[PDB]
Structure formats: structure tokens, C-alpha cells
């Protein structure tokens, strides 16, 4: 049973970034960090965490393809979304402080690392931050977020059909989920599960009536309808900037922040769509400290969790650490953890084991402590 | 249905074949060309613990109810780690 | 519900599970299919207490809380020798340094 | 006269102002007293978003009243 097995430092110090897993490597894009520059013209960022060697690397700046043309790469931003379809990360949305939000679709090839901006057609969603993105087949689904031009929360679903690069504003049936940002949306089968996020209890505008959603909402992509679903007797506290992932057919949500309670979270909740029920999960080991707007990616039976913001022991810090939650720890993993914990001499061990012990106990050098 | 795992000091451990398959190494050995396995290098106090891990793993896979941890005494951790690495489990 | 067991005789150790409600005799028939000796040629013990064929494991004291998969409860086994039974004898596992 | 600005988490910021001052003025004084650029600021009174052009007396903000400060969620 599931356990926090790795805690590593020296990664990118980022919150409000976006990341996808490609094989056993996690690609992290952009994000915010206090004290660093989010006004001037900077290229967006790509750091890669290797989940076998447990090393962070960073990709070098994008160069101009032809003299006189600018490099093709999104500007440094936060609150954007990234999804993976085949060999392509689709990056959309977000903002920086200067240029605000842009709604240009960006594509990133995970093998060649070239960026491009495929020509799209249809009703392009307005620029926004804090939306959710998820995919089913060749279709990307964008929901929610805070629209920069309309200046409002969104409860639209825009789908991008990457086969033709065509945006559709979906005319949904049923009661749409409440306008909101910094929610999550997770695909389980053909159904999109929307949880949490910041919202207004009366409408799509800020009005000093901010609320933290916890009535999960379900969107069927086959019939493009919001479903009416049974009550959940037990449910997690409302929150924003949690992480959501689907593993073995079930939804998991980690962490987040509730402003009404002024509380950061490091809990773990499982939702089973079939029983339609929630359950708080207690992993073994010391997890990450309560935090919000970290990123979570799935690598086999493990979740790579890294980044985010939390209060500083009003006085927030950004995280360069990284955690691994292992849903099914091998005996070898439990024994390395014991050898580390009891601080036993490792020089008897064969070099393959020692390489592993070293990997899980050595910081990367993207960042230094503040 | 059951298989026999013999330790270096000659203890015999009879475990469900499905449990022993938790070890990739044993999985390979039971499917060799042309049932029991002799481990000339793993003593009984280590191999008994490995079998308990088999039982624990199969029983608690895809389980979310809270359960005890798999206890690993310091005096056994280095040998157990070397065994788990050799057994790919 | 489930009790996780080690049935031990000399240098033999069987790992198996059973229900709290299953009987000592059912336990003997698992041994029979492994070690090819019938129940009437077996004695099963909880520590030093001989176990009756018709008691359930729970009635003998085996509880799921104390027979967990990572900490199986031990059941001693003795075979009939000729007209009499061998003494219950369990060889200890080796010891760490 | 004086007014207060409070975010959802807390941290009152009492500001010295007069009714003629615009909402842009109050965002300016807030930046002086907390180091928050006005573009990341959203002031709300009586559940209405305050326009940068209208002044304080245009929204009926008398002495001792509190405005609500909403910020860009740069850190989520």
C-alpha cells in the first residue's frame, strides 16, 4: 500500500506551472516565482524530471529558426494548461503581468522540442487563466478559468478537435457546473469530473461572495451533457489549486487552498465514479507540507508531485521540492527506505542498489535554498 | 499451485505459486526451459520475511482501507534489500 | 475474517490463509494436499495447545487482528511416526548479525 | 477621513483618503502602503466592482467603511 517514497530538493521553484508525463520523464512548463521577472519579454521554460534517475534538467533557450524571425516559443506565463496527445504537448491559456493573457494555441514536440502554433479555426476561447484542460482521443476540453477580456469566471466548455484544429463552443445540455477558476477537470472513461475551484456564490463576477466548490460535477462527452448525480454523504472540504489525477479508474485530489478557512491542504481524497463516493486516503510516510497549485503527474504506479505555494514558517513561499507517491511499493523500495531511515552502512550493497539509494537521496541543482 | 522455496540453511518455504510470482526472478525460474527453487545465498530469516511480503502484497493490492506497514527491522534491512533486489520484488 | 498462517514442522514452513470460521480439519486437508499425509496422521498446535479437528480457527484463538499477512500466526505440525506421534518440533530460522 | 481595505485572508490596510480621490487614487495609495501594483488590484464595495474613474463619493463610501481587495492569483 501507497506511500510517499521520495522527497527531493533543488528542482525548479515554481507555482502555477503546468506539466505532463512523457514516458518516465515529467515535462514542466512555465509557472510563477516571487522575485523573478514576469513583466519583460522572456521565453517560457521547460524543465524535465527523470523519474528513473530522479534528476531535473532544463532545456536551453529557443533560438530563431531563420535570421530575422523571432523564436517560436510562448512567453513566460503562469496559470496556463498543458495536455499531451501522442507526441505533442498542447499548451494554452495563462498570463504574465505585462501582456496579460493570450489565447494562441501552442504545440510542443516532446521528441524534437520544437514549438509551433498550428492554425486553428472555429470559435477560439477568450484568453484566461486558471482553466482546466483534459483530453479524450484527439479532443482537448477546456473548462472554466477567469476570462481576461470578459472579466468574469467562465463555465463554458470549448473543445479543440486536434484532427482539424477546430474549436467548438459546446452547447451543453443539463445544469452546467458553476463558473470557477483553479478547479480541476479529470477524464475517467468518457466522463469529465470537475472538482473544486474558486467561484462566486451568485454569478460569474467577483462580488465579495467568494466560495470554494466541493459538489463534484460530471460532464458526459458522448452526449455532451452535464449529468445529475447522486449525493455524496462524505466529501472533501471545498478548495482551489488542488491537483487532480485519475488512477485505476478513480479520481484523486491532493492539496489545495481554501480562502474562507485561510487553510492550505495536504490531504488525499479518492472519488469512485461507480459507487459515486468519496474516501479520505492516508498514505504512509511524511508527505509534502500543505500547499496549493503544485503539479501532479502519473508515472506508472507513481505520482510525481512538485512545486506550489505554502505559508512561510501574508508570508508565502514557493517550492522547489518534489515528492513521489507510490501506489504499490516494491519490497526493494521499502528496504531502501529502511536502509536510509536507520542510516545503515551502504558500502556492502551491490552497485546497482547503491545507484538507486543515491538517486533518491541527491538533490538536483536547478535551484538553491533561499 | 504451491511452490517450494528453499533457503541457504535448508529451510523449505511452501507458498502459493501466485504469491511467489510477485518475484520476477522466481517468475523466470518457474518458467525455465524443459516445482521448487533453491536459493543458496538467501538465509531462512530473510526468505521467511520475503514470503510474508508476498502475502502482504497480494492481499493488499488495490486496497484503500488503512492497514499496517510492512515492518522491516534494522538488523535485517541490508540483507532484505539485497534479497528483494535479487528477487526483483 | 481471514487469518494468515505459517504451518511449521521441522524445517518445513507452509504459508497459507483461511477464514476465522474454517475448521482445524479443513486446515489439515490443506496440509494433506501439500505434504501427502492424511488428517488422521497430523496434529496441529497453537503454541503448545493441541487443536481439535472440529473447532474453528477463531474458536482456537486465531483472529484476523493477530494473524495478519505481514505477521502470520504460527501453527505447529506433528506427524504420526509409527504407532505414536512424533514430538512437536519446529526448527528456528537463522539469525541476523 | 479614513477607509480600510481588506483581502479575504485579512491584513487590514487603513488608508488616509478624501472623497474626491478616484478609485485609481486608492489603488495608488495601496501600492504605496503594501507594494501591490494597481493592475493586480480589484476593489469591491457593496458587492460592486469599483471603476477606476469614479471617485469615492460616487459610490457612497463614507468614513470608517471597508473596501474588499481581490488580487491576481499568480500563485494560485
Author numbering:
A (entry chain A): 1 to 313, 321 to 377
B (entry chain C): 17 to 50, 58 to 112
C (entry chain B): 1 to 97
D (entry chain D): 1 to 76
From the paper:
The largest cohort of CRL SRs recognizing terminal degrons are the four BC-box proteins in the KLHDC-family (hereafter collectively referred to as KLHDCX), KLHDC1, KLHDC2, KLHDC3, and KLHDC1031,32. Members of the KLHDCX family employ Kelch-type 6-bladed β-propellers to bind substrates, and a BC-box binding EloB/C that serve as bridges to a cullin (CUL2 or CUL5). Importantly, we discovered that these E3s share a defining C-terminal carboxylate-anchoring element (R/F-S-R) establishing them as C-degron E3s.
To gain insights into the structural roles of penultimate residues within the degron sequences recognized by KLHDC3, the crystal structures of KLHDC3 bound to ubiquitin harboring Gly75Arg or Gly75Gln mutations were resolved to 2.6 and 1.9 Å resolution, respectively. The structures superimposed with the wild-type ubiquitin-KLHDC3 complex with 0.23 and 0.09 RMSD over main chain atoms, respectively. In particular, Asp325 forms extensive interactions with side-chain atoms from the substrate ubiquitin’s Arg or Gln. Mutation of ubiquitin’s Gly75 to the consensus degron residues Arg or Gln resulted in ~3- and ~2-fold tighter binding, respectively. The shape of the KLHDC3 pocket and acidic nature of adjacent surfaces explains this E3’s general preference for Arg residues in substrate C-terminal regions.
